[PDB]
Design a protein around this ligand. Structure first.
Ligand SMILES: Nc1ncnc2c1ncn2[C@@H]1O[C@H](COP(=O)(O)OP(=O)(O)O)[C@@H](O)[C@H]1O
Ligand SMILES: Nc1ncnc2c1ncn2[C@@H]1O[C@H](COP(=O)(O)OP(=O)(O)O)[C@@H](O)[C@H]1O
Ligand SMILES: Nc1ncnc2c1ncn2[C@@H]1O[C@H](COP(=O)(O)OP(=O)(O)O)[C@@H](O)[C@H]1O
Lengths: 450, 192, 435, 79
């Protein structure tokens, strides 16, 4: 039949799976060269991608031999501008009517420009569009990095209408009161691109969570019950909380965070009531991820429990895990730096079945972490992030994140004298030097045996 | 009669001797967040919240805290380990919350927790149920504190190894300053 | 921007395909009566409707039902833009499927029961991705327009093939069309207008009072006997405004332990502030917060005081409106009526003959009625009845019709349910078994 | 027991898996089957949306799916 032929032909090489981008560019999508040959698209060509919630965007298509044939590489900005997530399916369409822009009206989002002063054009939009020939579509939201922060901007209007390429003859209008956020999450929200040095561990977590959280109705047909509990192990500041938030944001899963001390600070009975209500809310707003931080505060070993009501909380957690069904679509993530202090009853089948060890990052892993916390920072040529990673042996994710923030403050004090209060165009121009990173290394507070 | 002016005999940096390097370190960490609090609204950099002062009794930990607060004009709230622990069950945590609440209201502020090992000792040294409830209350109050609140928490103990390791976590007591015993030069300064 | 930009107002006639405009507005925009127009709403959504002249419709406004509104991602008071579309050709074939959460337990073919009498000689404009509601057979089914030939939009004519093969569609980011709205609340015309005036500005335009130095109302006390629609009005207002609805229940709070009731009470206020613009609905507010003399419990007095301080601690910048409901206004603590807490009070009494007829129309929408049925006469007889009393009379006359008409597995077909008509005898039998 | 409702390839050798899975309890072996089952779902099925019975009954779990499940497993007796 007519409509049946439409729906069954949804296996066209024009329908591709959303994958991660190697190069973080808001205007560039990467495809396999055999896929672009099938779809008759040339490198550099602007394509129209249609996503979910009847939303669409225009991007530069680029050939990548590392990109899978049925997949498409796109960054978090492009992904959001299509109302999609990694693993979803979009359809790529030819875009031959992309005329250069006559004038574009762009405004920032208030929650990203809190405290920011001065002209946003010279600090952000000017170097952003400069000789880049960026495709721009009305209603889009993009992220610009620089000046110790990141600003989110909205495309208010385009001339010609709906979409145009921002050329050197395009007038960029960015005056007026910042726009207020509406039905869209922050582009600065933590994603997989914000977690470094745990490539293997991230892939493992992703495999376990993506199917139950992205396709929950799939296990209704299959008789296979997926994992419920995952135990993240690793020293403090190794990104356990980060990985959890990244996974929840990237999956669209409802994120409920239980904190070990937060539960244990409450009265007798109030801690278990809070513990139940946390599990209840997650089931109601499922697909969900319950993140139990410092899980050793709650549920320690029966030897280390020197309290009557404390043993009542360990038992409450075990039964909440047992009482949780696969059909509930809730994944519980526990985190501890003391895996051997945790009660062994949690490791039981039906509770915390799988365990991921997030150790200390190696030279390569540290360089990745250093790149993440220098994203919104202007760096000098005298800066060598490869050399810093070579020296910072025994540093965790937080130790490296603190080194960047300290080198950033050392740069603020050293370069800026009396202002009062700084404006964006001056913050975006000051560069963090190797001397600022050396000074931060000298005042730092950061081992592995067989 | 005194009017709208603080005492000239109030403790200042000129009253703390033998800790030249340690004082400069503390000053660098606190002066920017407490003297220019609106500056980090424009910058996306979140500064330190918690500082742990280490050193034997009478080494000037309380003094350094009062000196820093007076010299910065920061509101000084002093939490005392035994003072909190002398209160009834529930009254100690209510007092602990109210202390953090007052500091946020009167910010830029410095919360000084003296004898921090009385409150928040190690989980092994806690031989009480309501005692572990207070350690957990302190950790969540530190976590619940935002950079935007403009409050710096200073903890002091002569027993750094008896203190709960969960306090040293990123977001709580990130930095640690060791104020040891003064040398010949440092003692002469104190004598002056 | 004018005159294509119009304000969204309520529809007099509930039709999923018809929008009403003022005759001077249609003259300005050069649109005739019966012409299909393209309306553009929010979240890049749009629909096609039949434009009709209405002298009662305001010149800068547009009348449209909840179905048209939901299909445009708009709410009453919002602005849409009307455009003319000459591409409107009759349908060759349309693919229509139901929403799974609206066909739970339903059996048989949905074309003969719903879609066939729905499009019959109606010439309905249909746009791909739209969702509509069809009433009949003791329920209402929601249907999604999967595909149209010609593409994007077409008018469903008698030569249009209506293809319905496939599994029902799953709900996606759009609310149920069977959700409580202003069209579901009858007999309280004046009271509804009062509530709407107080809530629409603070909940639809919350950023507006940031510029103005005027603080709007926080608390509203709804008065009236049980089953007079206090809970209903609250849900209707929240749904129609898009406000987050948190419901506190008097007995639910009071059933909890000492301290747990307080903790639940503060968490309720906290959640509403976080998800604001919000409406906190405190049902049976007299269970919590009764008079000082009436209740002598120690922890009970602690809860009344907790509620008063939560009301005081709430700011106008929080964008939360608290709605209290009680059938005993004189048993409620007088401290709640203080300025800053429950400033305004609305009395929802018993509906009159006219008001009862309105209520009877609401709970007979999804019911097939005989010509022998006189809802005007039922309203004349049911004097002391409240909204729930009339709603129960309809459900009883409905299950009396089920027993009397049907005999002899338990899953009854949609085509058969849609055909059975409730008679005057079924309503007389329900009246006799009611007080 | 945990391959009863599963289509297995001829390349599958449950005798060889039992030879290798020394120190595995009942749950460890049950988890190995469910993991090899999911590895088969992902590897064989691309984009469906949601699978129907006649297609699920046809996909066979291979020795490669059991090898991949063995590589990611978390499983002693003295006198
Ligand atoms: N793997 C990492 N990559 C990048 N940044 C990291 C990483 N690990 C830690 N960080 C940074 O340091 C902080 C450490 O906090 P956290 O995630 O709570 O660590 P953990 O939960 O393992 O104790 C994070 O908020 C993040 O900004
Ligand atoms: N570094 C110092 N320089 C000058 N006086 C000091 C110093 N350390 C201690 N004192 C004096 O001795 C007292 C010791 O008390 P205190 O400051 O509470 O020490 P701590 O808190 O380290 O136990 C101070 O009140 C001060 O008068
Ligand atoms: N005015 C009314 N219009 C329509 N239905 C009504 C009306 N009043 C009451 N009902 C119905 O009666 C039932 C009970 O009323 P309810 O919503 O609980 O209000 P209350 O708090 O006054 O008891 C509901 O199903 C409601 O839809």
């Amino acid at each position: 039949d007519f409509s049946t032929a439409i729906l069954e032909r949804k296996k066209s090489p024009n329908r591709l799976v959303v994958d991660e981008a190697i190069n973080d560019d808001n205007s560039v999508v990467s495809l396999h060269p055999a896929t672009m040959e099938k779809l008759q698209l040339f490198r550099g060509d602007t394509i129209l991608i249609k996503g979910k919630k009847r939303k669409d965007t225009v991007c530069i298509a680029l050939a990548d031999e590392t990109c899978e044939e049925p997949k498409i590489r796109m960054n978090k900005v492009v992904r959001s501008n299509l109302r999609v997530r990694l693993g979803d399916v979009i359809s790529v369409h030819q875009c031959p009517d992309v005329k250069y822009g006559k004038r574009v009206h762009i405004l920032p989002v208030d929650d990203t420009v809190e405290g920011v002063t001065g002209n946003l054009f010279d600090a952000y939009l000017k170097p952003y569009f400069l000789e880049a020939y960026r495709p721009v579509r009305k209603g889009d939201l993009f992220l610009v990095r620089g000046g110790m922060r990141s600003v989110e901007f909205k495309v208010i209007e385009t001339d010609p209408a709906e979409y145009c390429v921002v050329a050197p003859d395009t007038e960029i209008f960015c005056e007026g009161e910042p726009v207020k956020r509406e039905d869209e999450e922050r582009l600065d929200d933590v994603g997989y691109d914000d977690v470094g040095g745990v490539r293997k561990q991230m892939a493992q977590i992703r495999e376990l969570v993506e199917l139950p959280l992205r396709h929950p109705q799939l296990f209704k047909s299959i008789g296979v019950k997926p994992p419920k509990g995952i135990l993240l192990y690793g020293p403090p500041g190794s990104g356990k909380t980060l990985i959890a938030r990244a996974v929840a944001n990237e999956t669209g899963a409802f994120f409920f965070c239980i904190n070990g001390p937060e539960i244990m600070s409450k009265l007798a009975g109030e801690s278990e009531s809070n513990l139940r209500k946390a599990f209840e809310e997650a089931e109601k707003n499922a697909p969900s991820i319950i993140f139990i931080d410092e899980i050793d505060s709650i549920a320690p070993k029966r030897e280390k429990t020197n309290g009557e009501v404390e043993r009542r909380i360990v038992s409450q957690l075990l039964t909440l895990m047992d009482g949780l069904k696969s059909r509930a679509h809730v994944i519980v993530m526990g985190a501890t730096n003391r895996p051997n202090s945790i009660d062994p009853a949690l490791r039981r089948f039906g509770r915390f079945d799988r365990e991921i060890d997030i150790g200390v990052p190696d030279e390569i892993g540290r360089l990745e972490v250093l790149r993440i916390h220098t994203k919104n920072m202007k760096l000098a040529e005298d800066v060598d992030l490869e050399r810093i990673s070579k020296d910072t042996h025994g540093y965790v994710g937080a130790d490296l994140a603190a080194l960047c923030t300290e080198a950033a403050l050392q740069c603020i004090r050293e370069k800026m004298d009396v202002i009062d209060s700084i404006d964006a165009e001056i913050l975006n121009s000051m560069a963090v030097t190797n001397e600022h990173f050396h000074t931060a290394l000298g005042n730092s507070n950061p081992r592995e045996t067989v």
